Design a protein around this ligand. Structure first.
Ligand SMILES: CCCCCCCCCC
Ligand SMILES: CCCCCCCC
Length: 205
C-alpha cells in the first residue's frame, strides 16, 4: 500500500487519467485477502468501473488526458444523457468505492473502535459505508451490506493480511497513514470536480 502510492496533486489540481488508473488498479487485489467470497462482487464493481474508464481513455489518451477532460468532453459528446453515461458514470461510482476505502482506512488509523468488541472492524466499515455509499442504496442493498459485514476479518488479522511482511501493527498503520495522504487528496479533488461540473447524481440502487 506504501508500494503503490498515488502521485501528489499537481499545482493545477488536474488528475492525469493514465497514472490515476494504474494506481487504483492495485486496490481490487486487497479484496481477495479479506478471506471471503462475499467480497468478490465488491472487487468486480471497482474493477469494472476502472476498466470502463480505461476503455474510454484508450480511445483518445490526449483528449482524455485528465479526469476533468473526461467529464467536459463527455458532457459535450452526449448532450442530455450526461452525466448518467460513459466514463463519467463509471467514475461517479468508482469515487464512492474509493471514498469508502478511504474512510474505512482513516477510521482504523484514527483508533476508532467498539469498546465492547474492540478487535473487530464493524464500526469502521459501518462508518465508511454511511459516509460513502449508504445514501445511494435502496433498502435491499443496505440489508445485504449488513449481512456482508459479518464476513469482515478481525482488525488484527486484516492488518496482518496487508503486511503480506515482517512488521508490527503500529508500523503497518503508519504505512497506511502515508498512503492516505495523496489518496484522500486525490479523491477529494474528484468529488470537488463532480460538484463543480454538476455531474453528481443521487439515484439509489
Ligand atoms: C486497502 C484496500 C482494503 C479495502 C478495505 C475493504 C474492507 C471492507 C469491509 C466491508
Ligand atoms: C490501468 C487500468 C487497467 C484496468 C484494471 C482493472 C481494475 C483491476
Amino acid at each position: 500500500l506504501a508500494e503503490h502510492l498515488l502521485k501528489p496533486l499537481p499545482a493545477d489540481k488536474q488528475i492525469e487519467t493514465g497514472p490515476f488508473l494504474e494506481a487504483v488498479s492495485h486496490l481490487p487485489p486487497f479484496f481477495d485477502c479479506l478471506g471471503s467470497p462475499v467480497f468478490t462482487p465488491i472487487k468486480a464493481d471497482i474493477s469494472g468501473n476502472i476498466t470502463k474508464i480505461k476503455a474510454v481513455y484508450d480511445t483518445n489518451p490526449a483528449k482524455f488526458r485528465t479526469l476533468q477532460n473526461i467529464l467536459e468532453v463527455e458532457k459535450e459528446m452526449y448532450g442530455a444523457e450526461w452525466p448518467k453515461v460513459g466514463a463519467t458514470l463509471a467514475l461517479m461510482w468508482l469515487k464512492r468505492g474509493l471514498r469508502f476505502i478511504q474512510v474505512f482506512l482513516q477510521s482504523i488509523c484514527d483508533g476508532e473502535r467498539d469498546e465492547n468488541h474492540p478487535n473487530l472492524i464493524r464500526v469502521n466499515a459501518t462508518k465508511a459505508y454511511e459516509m460513502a455509499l449508504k445514501k445511494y442504496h435502496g433498502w435491499i442493498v443496505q440489508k445485504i451490506f449488513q449481512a456482508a459485514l459479518y464476513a469482515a476479518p478481525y482488525k488484527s488479522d486484516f492488518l496482518k493480511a496487508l503486511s503480506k511482511q515482517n512488521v508490527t501493527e503500529e508500523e503497518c498503520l503508519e504505512k497506511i497513514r502515508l498512503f492516505l495522504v495523496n489518496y484522500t487528496a486525490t479523491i477529494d479533488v474528484i468529488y470537488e470536480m463532480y460538484t463543480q461540473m454538476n455531474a453528481e447524481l443521487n439515484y439509489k440502487v
